[PDB]
mmCIF file of C-alpha atoms and ligand atoms in Angstrom:
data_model
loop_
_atom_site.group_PDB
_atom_site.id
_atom_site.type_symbol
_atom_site.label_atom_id
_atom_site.label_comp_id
_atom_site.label_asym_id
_atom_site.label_seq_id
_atom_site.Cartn_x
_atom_site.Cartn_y
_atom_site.Cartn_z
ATOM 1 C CA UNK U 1 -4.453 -32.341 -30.328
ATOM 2 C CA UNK U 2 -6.828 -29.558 -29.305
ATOM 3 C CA UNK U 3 -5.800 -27.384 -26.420
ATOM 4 C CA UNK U 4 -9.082 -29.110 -24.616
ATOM 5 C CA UNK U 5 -8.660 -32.033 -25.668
ATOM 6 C CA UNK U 6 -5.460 -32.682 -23.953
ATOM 7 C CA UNK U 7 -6.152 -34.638 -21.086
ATOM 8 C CA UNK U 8 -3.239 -33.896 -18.745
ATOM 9 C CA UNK U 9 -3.085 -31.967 -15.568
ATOM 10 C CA UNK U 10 -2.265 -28.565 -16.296
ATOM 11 C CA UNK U 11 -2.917 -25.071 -15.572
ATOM 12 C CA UNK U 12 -2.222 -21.438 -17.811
ATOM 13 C CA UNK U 13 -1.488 -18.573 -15.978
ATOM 14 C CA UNK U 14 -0.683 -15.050 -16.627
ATOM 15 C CA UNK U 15 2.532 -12.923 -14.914
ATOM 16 C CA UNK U 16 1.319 -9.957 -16.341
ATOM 17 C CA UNK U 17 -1.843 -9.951 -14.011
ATOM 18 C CA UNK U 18 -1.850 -9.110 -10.468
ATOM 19 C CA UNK U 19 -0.383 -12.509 -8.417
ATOM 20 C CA UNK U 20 0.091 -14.662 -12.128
ATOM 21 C CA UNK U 21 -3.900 -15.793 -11.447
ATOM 22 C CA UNK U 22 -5.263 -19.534 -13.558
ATOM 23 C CA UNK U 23 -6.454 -18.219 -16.584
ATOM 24 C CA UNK U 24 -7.351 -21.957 -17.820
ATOM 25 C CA UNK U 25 -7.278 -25.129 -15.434
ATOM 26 C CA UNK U 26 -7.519 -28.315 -17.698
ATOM 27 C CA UNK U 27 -10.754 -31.248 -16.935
ATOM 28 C CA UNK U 28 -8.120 -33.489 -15.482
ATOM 29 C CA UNK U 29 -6.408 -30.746 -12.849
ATOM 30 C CA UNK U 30 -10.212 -29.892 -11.998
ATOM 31 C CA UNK U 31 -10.953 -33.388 -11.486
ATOM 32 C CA UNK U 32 -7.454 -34.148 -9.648
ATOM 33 C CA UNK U 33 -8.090 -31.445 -7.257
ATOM 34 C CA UNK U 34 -11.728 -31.724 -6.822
ATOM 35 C CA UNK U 35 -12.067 -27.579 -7.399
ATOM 36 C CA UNK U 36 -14.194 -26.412 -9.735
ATOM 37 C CA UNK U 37 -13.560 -23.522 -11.932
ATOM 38 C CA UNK U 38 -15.480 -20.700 -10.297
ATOM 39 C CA UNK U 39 -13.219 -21.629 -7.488
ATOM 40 C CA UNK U 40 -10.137 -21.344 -8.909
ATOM 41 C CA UNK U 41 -10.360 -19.594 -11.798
ATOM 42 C CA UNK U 42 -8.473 -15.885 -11.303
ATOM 43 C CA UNK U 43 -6.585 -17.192 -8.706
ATOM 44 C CA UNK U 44 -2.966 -18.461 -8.070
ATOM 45 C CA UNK U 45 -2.266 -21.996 -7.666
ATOM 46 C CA UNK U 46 -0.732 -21.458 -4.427
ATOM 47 C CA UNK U 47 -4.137 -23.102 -2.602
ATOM 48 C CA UNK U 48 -2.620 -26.411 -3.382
ATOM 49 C CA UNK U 49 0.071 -26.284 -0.912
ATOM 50 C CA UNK U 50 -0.431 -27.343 2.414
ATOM 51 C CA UNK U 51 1.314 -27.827 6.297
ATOM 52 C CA UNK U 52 3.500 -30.524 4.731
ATOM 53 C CA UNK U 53 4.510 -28.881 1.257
ATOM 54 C CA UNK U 54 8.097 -28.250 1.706
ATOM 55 C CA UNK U 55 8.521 -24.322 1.701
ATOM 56 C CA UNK U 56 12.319 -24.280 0.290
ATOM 57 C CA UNK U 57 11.065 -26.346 -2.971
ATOM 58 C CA UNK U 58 8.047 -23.851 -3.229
ATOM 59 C CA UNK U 59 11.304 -20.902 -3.189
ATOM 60 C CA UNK U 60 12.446 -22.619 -6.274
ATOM 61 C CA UNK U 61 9.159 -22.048 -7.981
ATOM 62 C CA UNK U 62 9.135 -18.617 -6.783
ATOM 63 C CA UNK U 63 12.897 -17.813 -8.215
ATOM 64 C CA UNK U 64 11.800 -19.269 -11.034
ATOM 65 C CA UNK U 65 8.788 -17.039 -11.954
ATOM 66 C CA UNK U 66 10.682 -14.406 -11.183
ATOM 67 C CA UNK U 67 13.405 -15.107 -13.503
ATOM 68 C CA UNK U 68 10.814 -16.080 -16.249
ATOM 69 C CA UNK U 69 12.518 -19.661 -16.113
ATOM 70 C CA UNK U 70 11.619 -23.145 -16.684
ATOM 71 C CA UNK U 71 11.515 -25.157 -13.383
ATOM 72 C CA UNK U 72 11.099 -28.791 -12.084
ATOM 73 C CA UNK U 73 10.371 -30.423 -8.633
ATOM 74 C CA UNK U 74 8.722 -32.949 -6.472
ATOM 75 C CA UNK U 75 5.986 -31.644 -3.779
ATOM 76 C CA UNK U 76 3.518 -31.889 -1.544
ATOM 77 C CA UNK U 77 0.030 -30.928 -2.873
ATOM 78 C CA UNK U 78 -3.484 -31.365 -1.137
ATOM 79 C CA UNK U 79 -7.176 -31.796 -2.669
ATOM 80 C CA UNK U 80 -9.949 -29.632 -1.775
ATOM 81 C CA UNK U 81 -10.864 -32.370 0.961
ATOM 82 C CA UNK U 82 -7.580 -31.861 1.791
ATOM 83 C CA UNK U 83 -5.826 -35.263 0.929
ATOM 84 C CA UNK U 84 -1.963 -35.196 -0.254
ATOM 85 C CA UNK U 85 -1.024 -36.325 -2.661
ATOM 86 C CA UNK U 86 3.132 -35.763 -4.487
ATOM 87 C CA UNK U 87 2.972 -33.813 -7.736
ATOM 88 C CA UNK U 88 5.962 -33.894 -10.212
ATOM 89 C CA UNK U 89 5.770 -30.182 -11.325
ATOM 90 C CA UNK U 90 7.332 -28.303 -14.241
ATOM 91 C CA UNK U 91 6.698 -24.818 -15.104
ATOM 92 C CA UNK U 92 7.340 -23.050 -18.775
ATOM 93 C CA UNK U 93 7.047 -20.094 -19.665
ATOM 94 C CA UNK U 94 5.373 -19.515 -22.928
ATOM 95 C CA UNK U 95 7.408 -16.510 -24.877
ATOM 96 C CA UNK U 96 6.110 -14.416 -28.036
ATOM 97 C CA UNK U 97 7.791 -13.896 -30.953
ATOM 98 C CA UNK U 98 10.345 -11.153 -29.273
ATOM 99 C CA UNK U 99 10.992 -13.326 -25.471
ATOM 100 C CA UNK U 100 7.979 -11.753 -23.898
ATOM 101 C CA UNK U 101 6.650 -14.051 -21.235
ATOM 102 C CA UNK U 102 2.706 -14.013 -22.318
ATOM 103 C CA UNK U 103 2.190 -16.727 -20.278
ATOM 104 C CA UNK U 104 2.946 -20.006 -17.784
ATOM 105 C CA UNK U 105 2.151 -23.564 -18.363
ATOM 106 C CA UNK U 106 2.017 -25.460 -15.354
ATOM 107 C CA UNK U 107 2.072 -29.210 -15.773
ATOM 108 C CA UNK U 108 1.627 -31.536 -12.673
ATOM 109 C CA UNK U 109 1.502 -35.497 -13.018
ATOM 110 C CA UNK U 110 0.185 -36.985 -9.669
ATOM 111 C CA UNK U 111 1.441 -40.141 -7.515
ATOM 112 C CA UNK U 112 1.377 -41.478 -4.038
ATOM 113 C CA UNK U 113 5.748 -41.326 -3.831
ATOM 114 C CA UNK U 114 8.276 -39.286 -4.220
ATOM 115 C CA UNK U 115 10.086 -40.489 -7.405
ATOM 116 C CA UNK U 116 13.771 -41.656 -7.874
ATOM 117 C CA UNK U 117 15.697 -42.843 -10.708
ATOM 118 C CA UNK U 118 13.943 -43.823 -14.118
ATOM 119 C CA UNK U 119 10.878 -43.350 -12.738
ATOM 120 C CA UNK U 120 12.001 -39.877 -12.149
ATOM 121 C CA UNK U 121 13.363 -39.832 -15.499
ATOM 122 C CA UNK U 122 9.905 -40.707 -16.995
ATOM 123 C CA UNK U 123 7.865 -38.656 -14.906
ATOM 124 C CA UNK U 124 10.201 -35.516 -15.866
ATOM 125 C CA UNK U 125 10.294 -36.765 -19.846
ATOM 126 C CA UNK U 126 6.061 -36.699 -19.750
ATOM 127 C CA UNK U 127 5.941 -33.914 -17.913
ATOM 128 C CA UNK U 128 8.052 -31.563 -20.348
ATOM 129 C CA UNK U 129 6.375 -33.683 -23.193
ATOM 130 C CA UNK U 130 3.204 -32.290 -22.263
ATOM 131 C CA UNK U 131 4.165 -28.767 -21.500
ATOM 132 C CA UNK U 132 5.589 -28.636 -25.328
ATOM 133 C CA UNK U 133 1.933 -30.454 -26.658
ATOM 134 C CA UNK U 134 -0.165 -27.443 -24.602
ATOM 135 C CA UNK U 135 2.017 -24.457 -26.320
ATOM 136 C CA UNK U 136 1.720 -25.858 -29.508
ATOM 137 C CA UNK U 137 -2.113 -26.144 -29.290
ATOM 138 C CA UNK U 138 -2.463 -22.742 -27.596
ATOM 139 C CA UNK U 139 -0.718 -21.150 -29.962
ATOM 140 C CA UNK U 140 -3.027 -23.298 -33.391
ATOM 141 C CA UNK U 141 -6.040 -22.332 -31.783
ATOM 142 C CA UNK U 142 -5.195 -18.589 -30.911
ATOM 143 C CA UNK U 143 -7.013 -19.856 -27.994
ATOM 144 C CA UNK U 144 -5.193 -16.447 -25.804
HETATM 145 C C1 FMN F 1 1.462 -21.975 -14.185
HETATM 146 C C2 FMN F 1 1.739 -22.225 -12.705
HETATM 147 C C3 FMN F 1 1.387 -23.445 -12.153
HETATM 148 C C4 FMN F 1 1.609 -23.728 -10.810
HETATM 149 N N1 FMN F 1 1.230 -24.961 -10.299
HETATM 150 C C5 FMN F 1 1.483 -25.253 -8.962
HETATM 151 C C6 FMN F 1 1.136 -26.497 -8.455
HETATM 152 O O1 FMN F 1 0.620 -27.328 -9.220
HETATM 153 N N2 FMN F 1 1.380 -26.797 -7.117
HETATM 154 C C7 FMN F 1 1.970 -25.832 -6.301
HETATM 155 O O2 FMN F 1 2.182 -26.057 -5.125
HETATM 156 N N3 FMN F 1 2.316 -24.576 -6.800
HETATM 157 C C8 FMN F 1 2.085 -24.305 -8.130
HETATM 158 N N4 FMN F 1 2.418 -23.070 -8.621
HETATM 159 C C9 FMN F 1 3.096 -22.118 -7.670
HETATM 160 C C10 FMN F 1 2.299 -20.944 -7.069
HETATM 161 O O3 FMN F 1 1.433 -20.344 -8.006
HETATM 162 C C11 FMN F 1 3.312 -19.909 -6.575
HETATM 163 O O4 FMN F 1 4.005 -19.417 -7.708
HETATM 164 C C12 FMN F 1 4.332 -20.469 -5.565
HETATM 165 O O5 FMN F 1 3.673 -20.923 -4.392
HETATM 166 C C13 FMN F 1 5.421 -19.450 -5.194
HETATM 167 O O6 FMN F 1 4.861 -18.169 -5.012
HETATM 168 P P1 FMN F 1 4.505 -17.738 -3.499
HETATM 169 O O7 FMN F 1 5.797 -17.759 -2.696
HETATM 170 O O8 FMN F 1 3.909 -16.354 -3.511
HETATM 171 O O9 FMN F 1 3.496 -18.720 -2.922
HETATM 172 C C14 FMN F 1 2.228 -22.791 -9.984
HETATM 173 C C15 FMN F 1 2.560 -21.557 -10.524
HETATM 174 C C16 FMN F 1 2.331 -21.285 -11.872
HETATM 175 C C17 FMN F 1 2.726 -19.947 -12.404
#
């Protein structure tokens, strides 16, 4: 139940640096990607999207970040070898005690297919699952 022991694909960034760089990329995302963490560390996720990621879904993410909203989609993502691979992806915002955004989870669970119907469901219900688990344990470890 320890923010590093949650082994889930997920990244932490922070809005309030220049481009909303990784400030903490979980052993699973590093492992799903194939990146290591003085690659991607300081940087925004952006590298995993590729000639097939579909730009209007990436738009969504976009709005959302700049409404300090929750979001979630389906999309194209690539390795560092540069295999695809669809990522269910939801994004929330972490807020402080008075609605600041400190920071972003960013929770992606990995499949060969774009999901539809309960599996869709399920995919969505883990995904937000998660997203709650990772503030929880950022915020009992004062880990930022
Ligand atoms: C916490 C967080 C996690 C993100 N995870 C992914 C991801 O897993 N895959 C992806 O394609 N984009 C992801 N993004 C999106 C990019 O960082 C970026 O916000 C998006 O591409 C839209 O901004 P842009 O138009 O400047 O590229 C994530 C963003 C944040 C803030």
């Amino acid at each position: 139940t320890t923010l590093e022991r949650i082994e889930k694909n997920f990244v932490i960034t922070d809005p309030r640096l220049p481009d909303n760089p990784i400030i903490f990329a979980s052993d699973s995302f590093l492992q799903l990607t194939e990146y290591s963490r003085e690659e991607i560390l300081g940087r925004n996720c952006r590298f995993l999207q590729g000639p097939e990621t579909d730009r209007a879904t990436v738009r969504k993410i976009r709005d959302a970040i700049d409404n300090q909203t929750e979001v979630t989609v389906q999309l194209i993502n690539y390795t560092k070898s540069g295999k695809k691979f669809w990522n269910v992806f939801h994004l929330q915002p972490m807020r402080d005690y008075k609605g600041d955004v400190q920071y972003f989870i960013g929770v992606q669970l990995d499949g060969t297919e774009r999901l539809h119907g309960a599996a869709e469901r399920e995919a969505v219900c883990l995904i937000k699952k998660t997203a709650f688990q990772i503030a929880e344990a950022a915020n009992d470890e004062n880990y930022f």
